[PDB]
């Protein structure tokens, strides 16, 4: 196919990192984003390095607390360009995530019940949480990739609530 794919997820501090390639869509001239499942709020990059069908994404998630936000919203990561194109997950970093221990191999093995389940239990020994001071309210910011079974796509699960919480 020809789509936008995501190959490495890792954060310095409080910045998301995000390494992909692309199948066949034209980088040069499209904005990465951040984007939830109800398109109303959407999160530009600070960085953007491109090289060739390669490409590196930066952005600063701890800005969504500065207005009005949700505290359980999915986020895609999305390629605008004439047409919007929704990151894919590499099964790579799926694979990597099943070299666990033998514990957490019964314990993934007692998903069962549904694919996605065990998916997202692979993924969220990837998940970040720091919380935000020198501010009025100290926040804690969760972020989780996970697969969102409601479209079927990759999403960074956050989920942004007080320490009291």
Request: charge should be negative.
């Amino acid at each position: 196919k020809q789509a936008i794919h995501i190959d490495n997820i890792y954060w310095e501090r409080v910045q998301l990192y995000i390494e992909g390639h692309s199948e066949g869509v034209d980088l040069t001239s499209g904005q990465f984003v951040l984007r939830n499942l109800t398109e109303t709020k959407t999160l530009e990059a600070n960085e953007m390095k491109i090289d060739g069908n390669t490409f590196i994404c930066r952005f600063n998630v701890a800005i969504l607390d500065d207005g009005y936000y949700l505290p359980m919203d999915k986020y895609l990561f999305v390629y605008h360009d004439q047409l919007e194109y929704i990151g894919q997950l590499n099964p790579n970093i799926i694979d990597q995530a099943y070299a666990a221990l033998n514990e957490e191999q019964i314990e993934e093995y007692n998903e069962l019940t549904t694919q996605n389940g065990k998916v997202n239990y692979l993924l969220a020994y990837d998940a970040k949480v720091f919380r935000k001071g020198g501010v009025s309210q100290h926040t804690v910011y969760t972020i989780t990739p996970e697969i969102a079974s409601d479209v079927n796509e990759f999403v960074f699960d956050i989920e942004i609530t007080l320490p009291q919480e």
